[PDB]
């Protein structure tokens, strides 16, 4: 069963700048040191990109602000996060986010990703349970804190997990887990790239173009998505539904897509460097 745990927080969200961030090879074409121009949905350059806060310990051990929203998915979203602790596990791509409506799901057990599209019953605040399992610190990742019911649902997929916890283990760069999603003609497309950002606070001035991970034969009318979080189930705590969870805090950056064209600079390594409008 699920819980309601935002319940008091509505403070205005923060904004930031998408300087040169959110580019990707929109094809599997091998190319050379040439100049190319492509038109598709893209994150606008220097867009007034939205920044959120997930679990937010804004207080001297006092408060655990937690405000993950659902979000519109007008035509495509750009998603990125630092979140050194792998507290983000996937997304809840959908339109209605309840029964009688097949919706998409993204979760990954730190060793492999599993993908579902189903007539779920996503509760108002989905999340995952991360908690020791009596066997050598091991922990299961039950997902009953997400959907009270999933059934009679068509498509499925399993693969290696996106979120590679590369050997950083100190913390100066955070690798800025980054993503771009679009859904057209019933096909759902995935782009990402781990990339260290030694900059302490905000998005980089550098350039790095994502790559097509997997294109998904989905055929769903995705209109509004919600990110999916993972919380560390507390131990014996007075109250267990709306109470102790969430080791670590989190936040992520979100910026919508829009149709556009851009001129790109390939290399002998076929690596894009910049685009213009």
């Amino acid at each position, epitope marked *: *069963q699920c819980v309601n745990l935002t319940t008091r927080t509505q403070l205005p969200p923060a904004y930031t700048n998408s300087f040169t961030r959110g580019v990707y090879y929109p094809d599997k074409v091998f190319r050379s040191s040439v100049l190319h121009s492509t038109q598709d949905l893209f994150l606008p350059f220097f867009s007034n990109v939205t920044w959120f806060h997930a679990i937010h310990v804004s207080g001297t051990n006092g408060t655990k602000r937690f405000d993950n929203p659902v979000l519109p998915f007008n035509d495509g979203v750009y998603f990125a996060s630092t979140e050194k602790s792998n507290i983000i596990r996937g997304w809840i791509f959908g339109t209605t986010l309840d029964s009688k409506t097949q919706s998409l799901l993204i979760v990954n057990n730190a060793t492999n990703v599993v993908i579902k599209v189903c007539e779920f019953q996503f509760c108002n605040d989905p999340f995952l*349970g991360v*908690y*020791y*399992h*009596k*066997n050598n610190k091991s922990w*299961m990742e*039950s997902e*009953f804190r997400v959907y*009270s*019911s999933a059934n009679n649902c068509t498509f499925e997929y399993v693969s290696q997990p996106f979120l590679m916890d590369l050997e950083g283990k100190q913390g100066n760069f955070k690798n800025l887990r980054e993503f771009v999603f679009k859904n057209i003609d019933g096909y759902f497309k995935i782009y990402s790239k781990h990339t260290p950002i030694n900059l302490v606070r905000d998005l980089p001035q550098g350039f790095s173009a994502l790559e097509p991970l997997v294109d998904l034969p989905i055929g769903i009318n995705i209109t509004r998505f919600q990110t999916l979080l993972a919380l560390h*189930r507390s*131990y*014996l*705590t*007075p*109250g*267990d*539904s709306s109470s102790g969870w969430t080791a670590g805090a989190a936040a992520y950056y979100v910026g919508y897509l829009q149709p556009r064209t851009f001129l790109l600079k390939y290399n002998e390594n076929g690596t894009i460097t910049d685009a213009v409008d």
Partner: antibody
Framework: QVQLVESGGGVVQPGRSLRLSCAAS????????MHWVRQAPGKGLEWVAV????????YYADSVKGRFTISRDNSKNTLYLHMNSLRAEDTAVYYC????????????????WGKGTTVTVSG | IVLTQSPGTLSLSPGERATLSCRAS???????LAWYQQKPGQAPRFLIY???SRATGIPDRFSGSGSGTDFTLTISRLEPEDFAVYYC????????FGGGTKVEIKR
């Protein structure tokens, strides 16, 4: 629709073992701790034992501590109460009931209950 | 730990307000008290948690309050089926069931 049924009750002589079964149907069964509550005739309910939904945690009352064990098969959607060294006072009606949450190291009230099976310990 | 209700039994005609004392040896963490109603030949139903929170499908006449080491279930007006033993439970870090409390029709 939410409903539990339990079986495995009946006679047994002291010292033997009996394995109570509680079958479940009508909710995402492998998502809730399950308690065992017994009620000897003429006495009030005495809580016995509760199992974590995945079984990682088990707790028992000192009344049966070290002498009862709890197990469950989430695939079968069924609850198993293992008992050995069944003393005389142990005979009672036995109720299986579900937690209200992930009984992990913590146990809400039992919210919906089965229908009870009777065990009688006698030579 | 030992929790005890009071009195041993309560005998009332239909309709009159009835209270069911619940005294705890120690203070129950965060008022994690629950109540139950059990009719002979049946299974206990779940009435109130948190010493005040009415549960689903429960008539509004059932209510209660308390904190610390002193609790009370109250039923404003009684109906013929409302006469069955009541159990007072605390559920923090370990369960414990009260000794039981029976409500009786008097004449």
């Amino acid at each position: 629709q939410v409903q539990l049924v339990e079986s495995g009750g009946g006679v047994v002589q002291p010292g033997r073992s009996l394995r109570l079964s509680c079958a479940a149907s009508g909710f995402t069964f492998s998502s809730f701790g399950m308690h065992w509550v017994r009620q000897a005739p003429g006495k009030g309910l005495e809580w016995v034992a509760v199992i974590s939904f995945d079984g990682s945690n088990k707790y028992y009352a000192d009344s049966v501590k070290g002498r009862f064990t709890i197990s469950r098969d989430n695939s079968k959607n069924t609850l198993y109460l293992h008992m050995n060294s069944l003393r005389a006072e142990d005979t009672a009606v036995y109720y299986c009931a579900k937690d209200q949450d992930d009984g992990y190291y913590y146990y809400y009230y039992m919210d919906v209950w089965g229908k009870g099976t009777t065990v009688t310990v006698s030579g | 730990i030992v929790l005890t209700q009071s009195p041993g039994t309560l005998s009332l005609s239909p309709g009159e307000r009835a209270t069911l004392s619940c005294r705890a040896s120690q203070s129950v963490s965060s008022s994690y008290l629950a109540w139950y109603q059990q009719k002979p030949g049946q299974a206990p139903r779940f009435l109130i948690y948190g010493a005040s929170s009415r549960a689903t499908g429960i008539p509004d006449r059932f209510s209660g309050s308390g904190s610390g080491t002193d609790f009370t279930l109250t039923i404003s007006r009684l109906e013929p089926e409302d006469f069955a033993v009541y159990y007072c439970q605390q559920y923090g870090s370990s369960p414990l069931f009260g000794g039981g409390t029976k409500v009786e029709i008097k004449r």
